[PDB]
Every structure is written in structure tokens, then in C-alpha cells.
Tab-separated table of C-alpha atoms in Angstrom:
chain	number	residue	atom	x	y	z
A	4	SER	CA	-0.098	0.053	-0.048
A	5	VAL	CA	2.647	2.680	0.973
A	6	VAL	CA	4.830	2.471	-2.401
A	7	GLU	CA	1.729	1.774	-4.564
A	8	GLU	CA	0.176	5.061	-3.103
A	9	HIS	CA	3.246	7.330	-2.784
A	10	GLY	CA	5.350	5.686	-5.689
A	11	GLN	CA	8.311	7.809	-6.943
A	12	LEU	CA	9.869	9.864	-4.298
A	13	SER	CA	11.644	13.104	-5.148
A	14	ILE	CA	12.805	16.359	-3.574
A	15	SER	CA	10.649	19.484	-4.177
A	16	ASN	CA	11.842	22.867	-2.480
A	17	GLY	CA	14.031	20.926	0.075
A	18	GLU	CA	11.091	18.526	1.050
A	19	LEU	CA	10.618	14.699	0.479
A	20	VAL	CA	7.446	14.480	-1.588
A	21	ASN	CA	5.555	11.685	-3.475
A	22	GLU	CA	4.759	11.309	-7.062
A	23	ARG	CA	1.723	13.587	-6.819
A	24	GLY	CA	3.949	16.222	-5.104
A	25	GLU	CA	2.640	15.703	-1.489
A	26	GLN	CA	4.924	15.943	1.419
A	27	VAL	CA	5.652	12.405	2.895
A	28	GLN	CA	7.439	11.300	5.925
A	29	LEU	CA	9.050	7.939	6.256
A	30	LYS	CA	9.520	6.325	9.733
A	31	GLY	CA	11.119	2.999	10.428
A	32	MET	CA	13.846	0.731	11.720
A	33	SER	CA	17.420	0.258	10.922
A	34	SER	CA	19.146	-3.131	11.204
A	35	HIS	CA	22.457	-3.315	13.343
A	36	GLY	CA	25.270	-4.500	11.326
A	37	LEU	CA	24.356	-7.156	8.936
A	38	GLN	CA	27.586	-9.054	9.655
A	39	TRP	CA	26.594	-9.372	13.395
A	40	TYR	CA	22.556	-9.414	13.690
A	41	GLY	CA	21.670	-10.215	10.059
A	42	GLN	CA	19.167	-12.879	11.304
A	43	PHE	CA	16.736	-10.188	12.229
A	44	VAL	CA	16.609	-8.897	8.588
A	45	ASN	CA	14.150	-11.105	6.603
A	46	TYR	CA	10.598	-10.941	5.044
A	47	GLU	CA	8.831	-12.158	8.181
A	48	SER	CA	10.536	-9.776	10.508
A	49	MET	CA	9.819	-6.790	8.042
A	50	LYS	CA	6.200	-7.803	7.592
A	51	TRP	CA	5.787	-7.898	11.335
A	52	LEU	CA	7.342	-4.367	11.655
A	53	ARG	CA	5.019	-3.011	8.810
A	54	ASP	CA	1.898	-4.576	10.203
A	55	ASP	CA	2.339	-4.285	14.029
A	56	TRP	CA	4.695	-1.315	14.194
A	57	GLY	CA	3.522	0.561	11.062
A	58	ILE	CA	6.979	1.088	9.507
A	59	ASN	CA	7.086	2.407	5.964
A	60	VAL	CA	10.959	2.087	5.353
A	61	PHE	CA	13.431	-0.321	6.371
A	62	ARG	CA	17.208	0.544	6.448
A	63	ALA	CA	19.846	-2.352	5.738
A	64	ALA	CA	23.087	-1.248	7.526
A	65	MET	CA	25.839	-2.913	5.466
A	66	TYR	CA	29.096	-2.204	7.449
A	67	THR	CA	31.965	-1.931	5.117
A	68	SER	CA	34.619	-2.494	7.720
A	69	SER	CA	34.365	-4.251	11.115
A	70	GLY	CA	33.972	-7.558	9.570
A	71	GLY	CA	31.448	-6.215	7.014
A	72	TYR	CA	31.467	-6.111	3.272
A	73	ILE	CA	35.166	-5.380	2.617
A	74	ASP	CA	36.226	-8.404	4.759
A	75	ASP	CA	33.389	-10.620	3.603
A	76	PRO	CA	31.137	-9.450	0.789
A	77	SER	CA	28.568	-12.170	1.219
A	78	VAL	CA	26.672	-9.540	3.208
A	79	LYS	CA	25.505	-7.786	0.096
A	80	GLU	CA	23.249	-10.802	-0.466
A	81	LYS	CA	21.490	-9.914	2.918
A	82	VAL	CA	21.101	-6.384	1.513
A	83	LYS	CA	19.452	-7.969	-1.672
A	84	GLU	CA	17.108	-10.066	0.635
A	85	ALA	CA	16.052	-6.863	2.521
A	86	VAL	CA	15.305	-4.870	-0.634
A	87	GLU	CA	13.442	-7.736	-2.096
A	88	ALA	CA	11.379	-8.110	1.059
A	89	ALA	CA	10.586	-4.294	0.919
A	90	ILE	CA	9.530	-4.603	-2.584
A	91	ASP	CA	7.300	-7.528	-1.741
A	92	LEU	CA	5.960	-5.706	1.419
A	93	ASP	CA	5.377	-2.521	-0.600
A	94	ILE	CA	7.610	-0.337	1.683
A	95	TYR	CA	10.770	1.824	1.026
A	96	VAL	CA	14.324	0.585	1.711
A	97	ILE	CA	17.608	2.247	2.302
A	98	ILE	CA	20.793	0.555	1.073
A	99	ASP	CA	23.335	1.845	3.576
A	100	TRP	CA	26.962	1.623	2.721
A	101	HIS	CA	27.752	1.737	6.514
A	102	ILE	CA	31.114	3.500	7.015
A	103	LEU	CA	32.133	4.187	10.423
A	104	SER	CA	35.724	3.146	11.626
A	105	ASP	CA	36.777	3.620	7.898
A	106	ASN	CA	35.993	7.180	8.586
A	107	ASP	CA	36.800	8.796	5.108
A	108	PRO	CA	34.310	7.561	2.537
A	109	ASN	CA	37.274	7.608	-0.068
A	110	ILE	CA	38.970	4.742	1.667
A	111	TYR	CA	36.709	2.253	0.021
A	112	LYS	CA	35.538	4.456	-2.913
A	113	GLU	CA	36.424	2.021	-5.664
A	114	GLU	CA	34.478	-0.821	-3.830
A	115	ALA	CA	31.540	1.675	-3.236
A	116	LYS	CA	31.185	2.558	-6.891
A	117	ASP	CA	31.072	-1.061	-7.774
A	118	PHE	CA	28.567	-1.792	-5.108
A	119	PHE	CA	26.324	0.872	-6.051
A	120	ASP	CA	26.587	0.090	-9.760
A	121	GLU	CA	25.370	-3.440	-9.017
A	122	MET	CA	22.519	-2.303	-6.731
A	123	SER	CA	21.282	0.316	-8.847
A	124	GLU	CA	21.577	-2.019	-11.937
A	125	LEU	CA	19.365	-4.621	-10.027
A	126	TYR	CA	16.950	-2.326	-8.562
A	127	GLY	CA	16.918	0.932	-10.245
A	128	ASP	CA	13.565	0.364	-11.833
A	129	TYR	CA	11.817	0.173	-8.581
A	130	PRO	CA	10.669	3.185	-6.553
A	131	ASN	CA	11.323	1.501	-3.287
A	132	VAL	CA	15.051	2.081	-3.210
A	133	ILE	CA	16.967	4.886	-1.267
A	134	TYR	CA	20.750	4.826	-1.704
A	135	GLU	CA	22.800	5.891	1.425
A	136	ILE	CA	26.344	6.198	0.071
A	137	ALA	CA	28.337	7.056	3.298
A	138	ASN	CA	26.723	6.301	6.658
A	139	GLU	CA	28.938	8.433	9.074
A	140	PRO	CA	32.084	10.357	7.699
A	141	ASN	CA	33.893	11.271	10.809
A	142	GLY	CA	37.286	12.648	11.939
A	143	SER	CA	38.656	16.204	11.796
A	144	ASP	CA	40.509	15.289	8.603
A	145	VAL	CA	37.345	14.289	6.712
A	146	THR	CA	35.513	17.546	5.592
A	147	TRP	CA	32.595	18.124	3.253
A	148	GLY	CA	34.354	20.145	0.851
A	149	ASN	CA	37.569	18.027	0.705
A	150	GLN	CA	36.521	14.537	1.163
A	151	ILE	CA	32.757	13.925	1.382
A	152	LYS	CA	31.366	16.062	-1.561
A	153	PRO	CA	33.967	14.709	-4.026
A	154	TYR	CA	33.343	11.138	-3.121
A	155	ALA	CA	29.636	11.794	-3.635
A	156	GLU	CA	30.419	13.374	-6.982
A	157	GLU	CA	32.062	10.021	-7.936
A	158	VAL	CA	29.362	7.675	-6.699
A	159	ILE	CA	26.287	9.631	-7.628
A	160	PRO	CA	27.081	9.396	-11.317
A	161	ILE	CA	27.529	5.560	-11.020
A	162	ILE	CA	24.082	5.320	-9.529
A	163	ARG	CA	22.618	7.895	-12.038
A	164	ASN	CA	23.826	6.064	-15.036
A	165	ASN	CA	21.265	2.948	-13.909
A	166	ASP	CA	18.743	4.953	-11.767
A	167	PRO	CA	18.093	8.687	-12.782
A	168	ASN	CA	16.184	9.879	-9.898
A	169	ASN	CA	15.643	7.690	-6.832
A	170	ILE	CA	16.755	9.323	-3.556
A	171	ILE	CA	20.321	9.356	-2.625
A	172	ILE	CA	21.282	10.260	1.109
A	173	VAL	CA	24.821	11.587	1.383
A	174	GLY	CA	26.502	11.608	4.925
A	175	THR	CA	27.911	14.804	6.496
A	176	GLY	CA	30.953	15.364	8.653
A	177	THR	CA	31.380	14.651	12.426
A	178	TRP	CA	29.295	11.434	12.390
A	179	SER	CA	26.692	12.964	10.012
A	180	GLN	CA	26.086	15.957	12.245
A	181	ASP	CA	27.680	18.869	10.092
A	182	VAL	CA	24.842	19.572	7.888
A	183	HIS	CA	25.737	23.280	8.084
A	184	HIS	CA	28.645	22.973	5.906
A	185	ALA	CA	26.837	20.699	3.509
A	186	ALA	CA	23.949	23.065	3.230
A	187	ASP	CA	26.198	25.916	2.295
A	188	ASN	CA	28.045	23.779	-0.459
A	189	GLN	CA	25.243	21.556	-1.826
A	190	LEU	CA	25.505	18.918	-4.450
A	191	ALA	CA	24.013	19.400	-7.799
A	192	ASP	CA	21.819	16.337	-8.269
A	193	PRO	CA	18.088	17.574	-7.370
A	194	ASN	CA	17.033	14.245	-5.540
A	195	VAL	CA	19.732	14.229	-2.861
A	196	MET	CA	19.318	14.570	0.920
A	197	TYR	CA	21.891	15.129	3.508
A	198	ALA	CA	22.079	12.792	6.510
A	199	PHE	CA	21.685	14.011	10.151
A	200	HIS	CA	22.112	11.590	12.854
A	201	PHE	CA	21.336	12.073	16.638
A	202	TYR	CA	21.371	10.230	19.953
A	203	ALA	CA	19.191	11.342	22.724
A	204	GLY	CA	21.647	11.113	25.313
A	205	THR	CA	23.309	14.353	23.922
A	206	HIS	CA	21.450	17.636	24.895
A	207	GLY	CA	20.008	18.517	21.366
A	208	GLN	CA	18.955	22.152	21.286
A	209	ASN	CA	21.740	23.380	19.249
A	210	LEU	CA	21.688	20.377	16.803
A	211	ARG	CA	17.878	21.138	16.327
A	212	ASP	CA	18.862	24.631	15.406
A	213	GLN	CA	21.540	23.605	12.917
A	214	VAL	CA	19.075	21.253	11.146
A	215	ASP	CA	16.852	24.326	10.911
A	216	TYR	CA	19.752	26.408	9.367
A	217	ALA	CA	20.389	23.541	6.727
A	218	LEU	CA	16.518	23.352	5.910
A	219	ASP	CA	16.670	27.234	5.485
A	220	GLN	CA	19.402	26.902	2.841
A	221	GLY	CA	16.877	24.616	0.888
A	222	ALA	CA	18.892	21.474	1.911
A	223	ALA	CA	16.790	18.280	2.320
A	224	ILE	CA	17.678	16.303	5.432
A	225	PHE	CA	16.948	12.719	6.138
A	226	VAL	CA	17.476	11.481	9.736
A	227	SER	CA	18.659	8.015	8.486
A	228	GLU	CA	19.945	7.059	11.945
A	229	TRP	CA	19.032	8.001	15.424
A	230	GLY	CA	19.164	6.462	18.946
A	231	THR	CA	17.358	6.796	22.329
A	232	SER	CA	20.776	6.134	23.902
A	233	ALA	CA	24.087	7.879	24.163
A	234	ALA	CA	26.354	8.248	21.043
A	235	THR	CA	27.967	4.980	21.826
A	236	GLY	CA	24.714	3.178	21.246
A	237	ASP	CA	24.465	2.399	25.056
A	238	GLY	CA	24.430	4.331	28.406
A	239	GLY	CA	20.859	4.541	29.152
A	240	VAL	CA	17.713	5.622	27.262
A	241	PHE	CA	16.796	9.304	27.233
A	242	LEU	CA	13.156	9.179	26.409
A	243	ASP	CA	12.445	12.971	27.344
A	244	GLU	CA	15.033	14.108	24.804
A	245	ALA	CA	14.010	11.624	22.354
A	246	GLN	CA	10.430	12.912	22.427
A	247	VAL	CA	11.636	16.324	22.006
A	248	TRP	CA	13.340	15.163	18.816
A	249	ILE	CA	10.373	13.095	17.677
A	250	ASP	CA	8.168	16.232	17.890
A	251	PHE	CA	10.927	18.421	16.202
A	252	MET	CA	11.046	15.811	13.337
A	253	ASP	CA	7.399	15.811	12.973
A	254	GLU	CA	7.110	19.661	12.796
A	255	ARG	CA	9.767	19.699	10.140
A	256	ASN	CA	8.476	16.700	8.357
A	257	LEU	CA	11.864	14.823	8.579
A	258	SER	CA	11.855	11.169	7.599
A	259	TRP	CA	13.753	8.853	10.010
A	260	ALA	CA	14.984	5.227	10.792
A	261	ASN	CA	15.855	4.201	14.404
A	262	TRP	CA	18.838	2.536	15.527
A	263	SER	CA	18.485	-0.532	15.841
A	264	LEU	CA	16.728	-3.816	15.380
A	265	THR	CA	18.774	-6.181	17.486
A	266	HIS	CA	18.636	-8.093	20.765
A	267	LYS	CA	22.014	-6.760	21.816
A	268	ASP	CA	22.465	-5.756	25.314
A	269	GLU	CA	22.803	-2.171	24.509
A	270	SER	CA	20.229	0.630	25.388
A	271	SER	CA	19.713	1.548	21.843
A	272	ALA	CA	18.805	-2.073	20.826
A	273	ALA	CA	14.963	-2.236	20.170
A	274	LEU	CA	14.781	-6.130	21.177
A	275	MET	CA	15.306	-8.387	24.397
A	276	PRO	CA	17.644	-11.267	24.160
A	277	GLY	CA	14.691	-13.651	23.644
A	278	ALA	CA	12.993	-12.025	20.596
A	279	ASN	CA	12.299	-14.236	17.686
A	280	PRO	CA	14.349	-13.267	14.589
A	281	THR	CA	11.183	-13.580	12.422
A	282	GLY	CA	8.821	-11.214	14.463
A	283	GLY	CA	5.754	-11.658	16.468
A	284	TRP	CA	7.216	-9.877	19.482
A	285	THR	CA	5.328	-9.599	22.807
A	286	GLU	CA	5.721	-6.551	25.075
A	287	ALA	CA	8.351	-8.318	27.133
A	288	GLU	CA	10.440	-9.061	24.114
A	289	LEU	CA	10.734	-5.258	23.373
A	290	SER	CA	13.328	-3.329	25.179
A	291	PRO	CA	12.720	-0.159	26.747
A	292	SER	CA	13.865	1.602	23.495
A	293	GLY	CA	11.956	-0.701	21.091
A	294	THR	CA	8.765	-0.148	23.094
A	295	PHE	CA	9.078	3.626	22.700
A	296	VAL	CA	9.956	3.573	19.121
A	297	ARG	CA	7.260	1.236	18.255
A	298	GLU	CA	4.751	3.648	20.051
A	299	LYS	CA	5.993	6.487	18.084
A	300	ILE	CA	5.487	4.643	14.707
A	301	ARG	CA	2.116	3.463	15.632
A	302	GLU	CA	0.861	6.648	16.797
A	303	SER	CA	2.099	8.247	13.437
């Protein structure tokens, strides 16, 4: 129903819109690393998220390093499984080239190009796909102008040769926080968005104001990863500040994916150790974070 109704997404005046030009807001879940917790990514778990949580997007977090794709490329086939499940479920899907310790996207740029060529050739004639080309550039030696923007200007043409206009999400500096610099030096492609990531354990008032600065430059922002925890993914759940962010995203019509769908014993994990990898969770099988996120998507 979702993808049939909204169909082809695009950016108009800095906003995510559907094929009839109406604003649309995506809300869903990210997997954790597909090399560690891939068992939670399958048609049945995604169907349960769609029907019980109300998700309309799912993010496949394919780590590049940390035992991910560069070390063992077999994980690309789990991405394919997730994309095909989203197509069958009629929801959107984010293909996330999940850089992190490999903090400069240029480190594995050749592999990224080849990977995005393959994925855009396979799936580029579906409206479901959103390409996230560099999860979290980070480090003081990785800047928008010098590192990230030129990387995107190599990867985006590869995608565009196969898929002229599905959304592309481009990471920003300082773990996808520095939307100010991107918004002042935007990419040319009209269907680009810039990633902004937050963690509710950080006091967020200035980060909200920086998001607003970026939006005021006409840049489109996708909150492609956020957590209820601290920036490590652990250290408590911070629901008061999470709710502030939720309300801010709704007011600004910002799409989002929560980190993350796993039973790992960390505060940002949505599931408890028990939880069936094929869905059907009881309340007891959701973590404090997962219960909250589920409520947010259901109330939407």
C-alpha cells in the first residue's frame, strides 16, 4: 500500500514528496550491522514491523569494515534479501554503505562504486530504493568540501547511469552531524538529501537549530539513523530528549530510521535477548527503547 500510493519519491523545494507532489514522511527501523545481526533482517520480521509497528521504510546497515562487506562481501546478499522483502511488502528501503571506523568514505570508494553500480542496476527500476552512500564520515581530517562532496560526486554518477532519480542520502561530517557545511555547499543532483544523525543522550537544542539552518538553505535532510541512547549506542535510554526530537522531526516533516533492530544488550537495541528473529514480539520481548520507538511509529 505505501509504495503503491506514494510511488516515486523526489525532492521539491527541500522536502521529500511523493509522485503527486505531496509531502511524505518515512518512519522505520535500521538493522544493526548485517555481519553481526543479520538474522533479524528477513521478510517475516519486516512484515511484522510493517503490520504491528507501522513502519514504511527499512534500513539495511551494511558495514563496510568491522567484519562487513570489505572483509566478507557475502553480506551484500542480505542487502538484496532486504530490498526484495521491501518490494514484496510495498515499503521503502535504504541501502546503507555503512562506513564508520573507515572514517573517510574515500577509503573504499572503488568498492563503493562497484557496489552501487550493482545495486542500482538490479533495483533501479523500482521506486522503493533509497541509496545511502556513506553512513557516518567522521574525523577532523574528513570535511565536506575536501572529502565527502567529491566522493559523492564520484558515486552519484555511477548510480545515475542506472537509476536517474531515486533518492540518494549523503553523509555529512562529524558522524553525520555537520549539515551546516553541506547546506552551504550543496551537491548538484536534485534528488539528494543530507544525513543527520542524533542520539538522545546528547542535549540537542543546538543540533535542532543547526538542522533548521540547513533546511533554511533549501537542503533536504533525512535522519537516517538516530538512537534513544548515548552516542555509543549504550549508556541509558533518554526518552525525554527523544520525544523532543520526535516532535521536532514531525514539525519539520523529517523522515527517520531508528537504530537498531537487534537483541544486543545495549540501550539503543529495540529487542530483548529472547526475541524471535522472524517477528511476532510480545511486549516483554521489546526493550525499553523498542517499546518507545514502536509507540512513536504506531501513533504516526
